[PDB]
């Protein structure tokens, strides 16, 4: 196979087979002939009809991926012969990125990066979409050579073509969200530090020049900024956010309005690779409760077994709370519930800092919860994992309860009042919606702690 890595066990890939067929059609007209003669031949052939047009575009595309010494010539021919502004090519790129990226041969990956950059420079329609789909293949919690290569490669395109990036509000927010998150992972070697600095400068310039566009991210932007707050460039940014927000934008009152704005789902989703999503969605829709062990083991083995992978866990947790909102039929079935997934992910934490970050991600929509603007499905997992862990693993219930109390003055002290109000609104609304009918039997349960059972029977009087 020319596009994909395959073992002898792997079935033949239908998409790879189709692209190879197309390349061989183009090749039948371009080999052994001059470049002018070749273009005359392709022009003629394309005119015969729309499927021939597809064959030729997909052919040239595949040659660009598989023949780097013919790539510049073939992109030139592609641009010339394409009748749909390279749209068929863009769909196929997105298809390759969403479905085949992990199997894509090194040469083909290198070439694809080259192609996208060439697409940006040409001002092709939809290129910004392609860049976002590309960014989604950069996995969080992964500092392998190939993943780091992709992070830097895409960043280089974005920075070199920053003027073009500024035309796309969504691409600005997405690039900032993506790189603010990856920065956390980029330390430990000289190579990682050098890349982090480039990512810092890039995010900082977009935040300062286009703050308002970055705000469409919503409150999770704050979580990401806190996680990089000790980096000098970001300390400066914070004092501007906290003390004179107006420099950032006249339309930016302060951090509160940002905390009171929900996070858009596309941002939470972009920090899971296609394979991560496919697996979690399958777990939360098709896996029967009681049958989840091997699925969990398989997921854990692939994504959560390295020390570097720890940061990936908050992304999964925000994704479960904010993106996976199961139908009524799933909720009323024996399907693996979101709270069980959450409980599983919490036990895979291998340090107290990871645990704390995980808990913050779980409760993140509790902090400033307004019942008319926020979805109750975002706050449901936390309360349900607390409730259902009472008997079996009372350790989990206890610690989350402790965190729920202590996060109020600690999350962001000048807004303790608001956070307190948020946690209260969350709790109230959880009762009003019958997610949990009674809050009392969670605070007096005999299987709890001496100190905590007391700490509970205090912090909220309304639950005795």
């Amino acid at each position: 196979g020319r596009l994909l890595l395959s073992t002898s066990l792997d079935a033949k890939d239908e998409l790879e087979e189709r692209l190879e067929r197309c390349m061989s059609i183009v090749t039948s007209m371009t080999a052994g002939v001059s470049e002018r003669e070749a273009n005359d031949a392709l022009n003629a052939y394309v005119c015969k009809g729309l499927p021939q047009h597809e064959e030729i575009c997909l052919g040239l595309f595949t040659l660009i991926l598989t023949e780097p010494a013919q790539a510049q010539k073939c992109y030139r021919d592609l641009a010339l012969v394409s009748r749909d502004g390279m749209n068929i090519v863009l769909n196929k790129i997105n298809q390759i990125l969403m479905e085949k990226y992990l199997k894509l041969q090194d040469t083909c990956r290198t070439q694809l990066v080259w192609l996208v950059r060439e697409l940006v420079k040409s001002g092709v329609l939809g290129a910004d979409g392609v860049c976002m789909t590309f960014m989604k293949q950069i996995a969080g919690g992964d500092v392998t050579a190939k993943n780091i290569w992709l992070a830097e490669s895409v960043l280089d395109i974005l920075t070199e073509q920053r003027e073009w990036v500024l035309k796309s509000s969504i691409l600005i927010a997405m690039a900032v969200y993506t790189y603010l998150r990856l920065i956390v992972d980029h330390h430990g070697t000289a190579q990682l530090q050098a890349l982090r600095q480039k990512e810092v400068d890039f995010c900082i310039s977009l935040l300062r020049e286009r703050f308002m566009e970055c705000l469409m991210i919503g409150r999770d932007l704050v979580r990401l900024l806190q996680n990089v707050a000790r980096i000098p460039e970001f300390e400066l940014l914070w004092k501007d956010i906290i003390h004179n927000p107006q420099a950032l934008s006249p339309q930016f009152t302060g951090i509160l309005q940002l905390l009171q704005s929900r996070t858009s789902r596309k941002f939470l989703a972009c920090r899971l690779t296609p394979d991560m999503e496919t697996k979690l969605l399958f777990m939360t829709s098709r896996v029967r409760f009681g049958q989840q062990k091997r699925y969990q083991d398989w997921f854990q083995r692939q994504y959560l077994s390295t020390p570097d992978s720890q940061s990936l866990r908050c992304d999964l947790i925000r994704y479960i709370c904010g993106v996976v909102h199961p139908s009524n039929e799933v909720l009323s079935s024996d399907i693996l519930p979101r709270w069980a997934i959450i409980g599983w992910l919490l036990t895979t934490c291998t340090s107290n800092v990871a645990a704390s970050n995980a808990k913050l991600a779980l409760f993140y929509d509790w902090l400033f919860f307004s019942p008319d603007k926020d979805s109750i499905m975002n706050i449901e997992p936390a309360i349900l994992v607390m409730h259902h862990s009472m008997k079996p693993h009372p350790a989990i219930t206890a610690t989350l309860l402790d965190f729920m109390c202590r996060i109020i003055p600690n999350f962001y002290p000048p807004l303790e009042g608001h956070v307190r109000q948020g946690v209260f609104s969350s709790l109230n609304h959880i009762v009003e919606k019958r997610v949990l009918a009674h809050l009392a039997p969670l605070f007096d349960n005999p299987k709890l702690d001496k100190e905590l059972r007391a700490m509970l029977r205090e912090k909220f009087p309304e639950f005795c």
Partner: protein, 107 residues
Amino acid sequence: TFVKDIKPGLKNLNLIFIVLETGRVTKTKDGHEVRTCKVADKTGSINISVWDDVGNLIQPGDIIRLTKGYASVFKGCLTLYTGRGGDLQKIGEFCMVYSEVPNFSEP
């Protein structure tokens, strides 16, 4: 064809399954590696014994299509195998529901 339909002596078995477990490798007296993999359908589970290199490629979670399989009893255990002219081909991973029970390979 489903796992539950597999019977001693049947051949030309074509089916799909997801692997749950890969066992330890043993060596035949003439130098072949053999390993037993537990695989499953929504109708239950069965062992497949896989000779040689493909045996090292198979991973738990793999969704595999078997063509021209045959079945036979080895050490009291109904077992599935790849026939002459047949093969194992991975067509996906993870996303398949299955039942562990019955285990058609129990003695």
